[PDB]
């Protein structure tokens, strides 16, 4: 666990866990958990880091 | 940037007697 999740990989996971959720049912906690983490790395100017 | 997952966590006339109680 000597890492810090990459902003693109998380966002990607979320876009496909949004899609995935339609055929196979997914745990909503994983998306909300991600969504929250994406907001922590959000600067007003320059939107995402 | 420095941080790691840890332990030490809590949640992850009348001379008569009667009725004493």
Description:
Chain A is an all-alpha fold and 49 residues long. In chain A, 55% of the residues lie in helices and 0% in strands. Chain A has two helices and no strands. At the A-B interface, loops of A face loops of B.
From the structure above, extract its key features.
49 residues; 2 helices; 2 chains; 0% strand; part of a larger assembly; globular; mainly alpha; hydrolase
How many strands appear in the DSSP assignment of chain A?
Answer: 0
Shape type of chain A: globular
Which chains make the largest contact? A-B, 3 and 3 residues
Please work out how many helical segments of chain A DSSP would assign.
2
List SSEs of chain A in N-to-C order. HH
Report the sheet-strand fraction of chain A: under 5%
Distance between the termini of chain A: 21 Å
Subcellular location (chain A): Secreted
Subunit structure (chain A): Homotetramer; disulfide-linked.
Family (chain A): Belongs to the protease inhibitor I39 (alpha-2-macroglobulin) family.
Protein name (chain A): Alpha-2-macroglobulin
């Amino acid at each position: 666990g000597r890492n810090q999740g990459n902003t693109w990989l998380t966002a990607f996971v979320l876009k496909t866990f949004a899609q995935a959720r339609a055929y196979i049912f997914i745990d909503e906690a994983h998306i909300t958990q991600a969504l929250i983490w994406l907001s922590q790395r959000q600067k007003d100017n320059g939107c995402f880091r | 940037c420095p941080q790691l997952q840890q332990y030490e966590m809590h949640g992850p006339e009348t001379v008569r007697k009667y009725f004493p109680e």
